[PDB]
């Protein structure tokens, strides 16, 4: 799998900083490129982490899996600490499209089995049902990865 951590065994001290208004779920892609969840971060809190050089991390809203960014990008990769200097992973919200943002709010209020009782244009029912998914994201980042490598 193109997207996966490397078993470097080279320790890297990282500090997750949840600079977002969401409960953050840090996801670690193991050696087989499989998503593994870790302890969530409450809004505006930070936490020290013992990771390793070459490991991959991504972050999502713990309860909805809405996509989030780390240091402005999709993936975070620990590097060797330079002079005991910890590596920062600043988690923030991305600028969602107005539509995606509205979809989030609606999903957070209406139970899936009720989406279709809403008085909105048909097409939007499917958009609501198609909630963010980490697996699909990986597949997407994978193909985006392949394009950026011609």
């Amino acid at each position: 799998p193109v997207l996966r951590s490397v078993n470097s065994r080279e320790p890297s001290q990282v500090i997750f900083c949840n600079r977002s208004p969401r409960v953050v779920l840090p996801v670690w892609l193991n050696f087989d490129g499989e998503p593994q969840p870790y302890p969530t971060l409450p809004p505006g809190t930070g936490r020290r982490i013992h990771s390793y050089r070459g490991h991959l991390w991504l972050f999502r809203d713990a309860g909805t899996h809405d996509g989030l960014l780390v240091n402005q990008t999709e993936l975070f990769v620990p590097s060797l600490n330079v002079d005991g200097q910890p590596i920062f992973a600043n988690i923030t919200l991305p600028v969602y499209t107005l539509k995606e943002r509205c979809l989030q709010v609606v999903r957070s209020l209406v139970k899936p089995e009720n989406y279709r009782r809403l008085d909105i244009v048909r097409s939007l029912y499917e958009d609501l049902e198609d909630h963010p998914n980490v697996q699909k994201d990986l597949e997407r980042l994978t193909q985006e990865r392949i394009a950026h490598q011609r």
Partner: peptide, 27 residues
């Protein structure tokens, strides 16, 4: 923008209308 991004606030009572608008205005 590299700065911390604030949440875009959307009151529940306007969610649907705003959604159709956003869909209509493609943004």
């Amino acid at each position: 923008s590299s700065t911390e991004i604030p949440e875009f606030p959307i009151a529940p009572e306007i969610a649907l209308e705003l959604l159709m608008a956003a869909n209509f205005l493609d943004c």
